[PDB]
Amino acid sequence: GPSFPEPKVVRSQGGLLSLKLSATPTPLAIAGQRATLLTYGGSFPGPTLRVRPRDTVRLTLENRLPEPTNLHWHGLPISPKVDDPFLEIPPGESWTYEFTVPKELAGTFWYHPHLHGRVAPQLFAGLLGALVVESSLDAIPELREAEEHLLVLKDLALQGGRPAPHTPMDWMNGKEGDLVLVNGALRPTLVAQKATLRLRLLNASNARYYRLALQDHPLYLIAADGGFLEEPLEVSELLLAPGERAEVLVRLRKEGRFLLQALPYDRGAMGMMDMGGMAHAMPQGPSRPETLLYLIAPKNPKPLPLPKALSPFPTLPAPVVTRRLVLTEDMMAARFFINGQVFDHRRVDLKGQAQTVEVWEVENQGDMDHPFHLHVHPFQVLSVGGRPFPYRAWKDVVNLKAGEVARLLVPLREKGRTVFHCHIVEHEDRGMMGVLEVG
Amino acid sequence: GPSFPEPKVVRSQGGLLSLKLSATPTPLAIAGQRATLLTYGGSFPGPTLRVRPRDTVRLTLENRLPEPTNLHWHGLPISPKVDDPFLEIPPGESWTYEFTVPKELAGTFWYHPHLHGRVAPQLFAGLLGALVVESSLDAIPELREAEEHLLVLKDLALQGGRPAPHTPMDWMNGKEGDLVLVNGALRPTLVAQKATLRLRLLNASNARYYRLALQDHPLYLIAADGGFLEEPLEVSELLLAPGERAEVLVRLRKEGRFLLQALPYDRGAMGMMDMGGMAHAMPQGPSRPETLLYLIAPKNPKPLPLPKALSPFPTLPAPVVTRRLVLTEDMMAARFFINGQVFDHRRVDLKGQAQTVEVWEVENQGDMDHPFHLHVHPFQVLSVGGRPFPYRAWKDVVNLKAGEVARLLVPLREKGRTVFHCHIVEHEDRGMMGVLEVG
Ligand SMILES: [Cu+2]
Ligand SMILES: [Cu+2]
Ligand SMILES: [Cu+2]
Ligand SMILES: [Cu+2]
Ligand SMILES: [Cu+2]
Ligand SMILES: [Cu+2]
Ligand code: NA
Ligand code: NA
């Protein structure tokens, strides 16, 4: 096949993407070994769905797992009656998700399970795939002529030819695996044919962070989780927390081989030590550096000019309420809280008004990084840790280091009951989730 | 003094730059040796004059040379009754140049002799200096916060402690020297204090070309000879022909030492060979690579963002005439022609109308590069060699390789008699010059 593996793409046809997926245990070859994973569509990652605004998506999910499951359409501003975090599809049963892609939307999204208490083992075992919303902006020459690739960043650990089970420490930290894969492949080679690459990046890991840096090159950020920036932003590295997405342009500077690496990053994961008295929790410290892929540049590369502008960010109405959400941890219990409470699906925590704008101040009073995710209602990050964000774009996950406050502008869109939660999915399963009702 | 030598600056005071310079043989230390050069203001290069639009310049030139001389205000769109190419200042005499700096003007200009038949030895001996027109655009943060430096690129050859005399081959080729200097210094070190540098570049050499490249870095072109571009243009290298100027931003990428080099370039200079029968002219081939300066980057450099826009280029009226000027050579005679004729100060070659726009097609039917210069009337280069120019900016010198046609939009500004000529100044002295009269 092609030097660079990417998930098979399913495209809408005549404005309709009608597809039946099965969630199923699937024997496959992965990273040179045979394993049985849980997959959508028989592959890991699942198929990439590629749609345009105003397309109809009709996705029938058949549950062939031994436990109930459902789908979260991560990042899509659609109705929580479709993107329903409380729905359960029993083993052997099917459910059809049907929605229209919003008109004012573009970027890289993804789908994965969201059945409270079961997300972390299901996602870790292989249940996820990407969804791309194509834009009329992709026809501008500076993007159309770039070489486009999707990079699904997801790690894995195998034991006896199956995903390794969760340990107690995994529930506290979030589980990371030793196989650090791109599109399910171990350190693939990307032999570039053009001098400008457009890379869609997805962190679909349970808990692993990717401090991305390409040897000898900057990255040009052009989209965040849920939409384009207003203009490209040059960065020397890009941190992608669990659930985040980004699109970058890479402008290859000379012939040669360049490593794309996940540089060392300390997210506050903890271990246990005994040195006499004891035993106490001790920081694991920074992650070991990983090579994600080998990028081979073409001969005499002459990159395109960057686009001057991308998409103007909407002017938002003045906000009508300020919320404060405080994240805390009980690490030894592996319990995680928002404003002192664990998730209860019967309890509404916040009540807001559709088509108003809110300011959410999310404060991490824990010691671990927590990537905060809100369903249904994309937000504008104003500042994190007191530092203003250097761009305007729609996001739906924001990473908070220990002690940091994020200030978020949140336009409330579709009415209904939805959730917000940590996207270290073990922490969500262990209670770090709350309920928003929009009326 | 400072690690990086630059000419002393004279600034206008209260809207007036009133200065008396003397053109004088001057003993000095240069490149570690003692030599007697011909200088303005006792220095090599002469002092940098720094003015703003609408300033008055009152420059009294005292001629203390043993031959007549004058000044050309290279690149300034002022009256040819001030910038007078036919004026002669006899030895011992003085002349006052007085003019107002045009309102719509910015960039790096320069001054040097323009007495036909004597330019090449006078310029080679050290008579030149820079003139900077400051702009309100220099207050935008992306320029104001850059570290600014002027680089006067000029080579020299010394013999018996004086500039080496011209040989017959020098009159044919244009004279180049073995001492390849920046601001009169041999391979200086620039220890950058900021991560973004703004470098004003001036080729004040008689004939040497500078194929500029900074190790490991692109250059961001922001101004041509006579004004800003509309937006920065990224280039991997920049060819600066005799008389050309440019301004570039340099965005230092990492700590370290980076060479600024004049890479090998073949301008078509000729030598003589005898291999049996013979003797015939033979190409000299490309220049040897030269190191111009050592650039030391600061610790943890974080360059500013580039400016998004610089100056919009004026919309010009539709042209009313097309001219064709053909350059040819008689190399063994060291004679050079425009449309088959050598310069005659009594003969008007072109007659144009003030405030109209002309298209000039300048065609190099020789084998050497010829950098074509027009006094008084800056032009827009549309294309050279059939390739469209990638930016809009005012220029006053355009380099033509063998066979190439340059297409130039030339708005005629001040009335009066002026000249156009090759800026390999030996070729001008040997006849490659003509007369334009604007009425
Ligand atoms: Cu998600
Ligand atoms: Cu968390
Ligand atoms: Cu969720
Ligand atoms: Cu000149
Ligand atoms: Cu010439
Ligand atoms: Cu001239
Ligand atoms: Na299947
Ligand atoms: Na003097």
Short mmCIF file of N, CA and C in Angstrom, two decimals, chain A residues 216-218 220 231 234 236 251 253-254 302 304 308, chain B residues 216-218 220 231 234 236 251 253-254 302 304 308:
data_model
loop_
_atom_site.label_atom_id
_atom_site.label_comp_id
_atom_site.label_asym_id
_atom_site.label_seq_id
_atom_site.Cartn_x
_atom_site.Cartn_y
_atom_site.Cartn_z
N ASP A 216 13.92 20.58 13.00
CA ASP A 216 14.41 21.64 12.14
C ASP A 216 13.31 22.52 11.56
N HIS A 217 12.04 22.33 11.94
CA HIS A 217 10.94 23.07 11.33
C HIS A 217 9.99 23.65 12.37
N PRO A 218 9.43 24.83 12.11
CA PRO A 218 8.24 25.25 12.84
C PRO A 218 7.00 24.58 12.25
N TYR A 220 2.85 25.61 11.31
CA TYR A 220 1.96 26.76 11.10
C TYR A 220 0.55 26.30 11.42
N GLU A 231 -5.89 33.53 10.91
CA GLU A 231 -4.70 33.58 10.08
C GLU A 231 -3.72 32.55 10.64
N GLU A 234 2.56 30.80 13.54
CA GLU A 234 3.80 30.04 13.61
C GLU A 234 4.09 29.62 15.05
N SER A 236 6.72 26.81 17.50
CA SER A 236 7.87 25.91 17.46
C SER A 236 7.50 24.51 17.90
N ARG A 251 6.14 23.45 6.05
CA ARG A 251 6.79 24.02 4.86
C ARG A 251 8.20 23.45 4.82
N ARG A 253 11.86 22.56 4.27
CA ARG A 253 12.90 23.55 4.03
C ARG A 253 14.04 23.06 3.16
N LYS A 254 14.32 21.77 3.18
CA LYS A 254 15.43 21.22 2.43
C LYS A 254 15.21 19.72 2.35
N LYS A 302 10.19 23.66 -2.63
CA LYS A 302 9.82 25.07 -2.71
C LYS A 302 8.39 25.18 -2.19
N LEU A 304 4.73 26.42 -0.92
CA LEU A 304 3.81 27.48 -1.30
C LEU A 304 3.90 28.62 -0.28
N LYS A 308 -2.83 34.22 3.56
CA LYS A 308 -2.79 35.44 4.33
C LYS A 308 -3.88 35.44 5.39
N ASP B 216 21.37 28.81 7.00
CA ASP B 216 20.27 28.20 7.73
C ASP B 216 19.02 29.08 7.81
N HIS B 217 18.99 30.25 7.15
CA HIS B 217 17.87 31.17 7.28
C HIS B 217 17.38 31.67 5.93
N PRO B 218 16.08 31.89 5.79
CA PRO B 218 15.58 32.73 4.70
C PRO B 218 15.74 34.20 5.06
N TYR B 220 13.52 37.95 4.64
CA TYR B 220 12.18 38.47 4.38
C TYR B 220 12.35 39.86 3.78
N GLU B 231 3.89 43.79 1.11
CA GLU B 231 3.92 42.83 2.20
C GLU B 231 5.27 42.11 2.13
N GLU B 234 9.20 36.21 1.42
CA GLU B 234 10.24 35.26 1.84
C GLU B 234 11.08 34.84 0.64
N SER B 236 15.00 32.75 -0.41
CA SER B 236 16.11 31.95 0.11
C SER B 236 17.44 32.63 -0.11
N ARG B 251 14.94 36.59 10.91
CA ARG B 251 14.25 36.04 12.08
C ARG B 251 15.11 34.91 12.62
N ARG B 253 16.70 31.87 14.29
CA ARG B 253 15.96 30.65 14.59
C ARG B 253 16.46 29.91 15.81
N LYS B 254 17.74 30.03 16.13
CA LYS B 254 18.33 29.31 17.24
C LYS B 254 19.65 29.99 17.56
N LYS B 302 13.42 34.47 20.13
CA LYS B 302 12.00 34.41 19.82
C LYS B 302 11.68 35.60 18.93
N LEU B 304 9.97 38.40 16.52
CA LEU B 304 8.66 39.01 16.41
C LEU B 304 7.89 38.38 15.25
N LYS B 308 2.04 42.20 8.72
CA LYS B 308 1.12 41.64 7.75
C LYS B 308 1.14 42.44 6.47
#
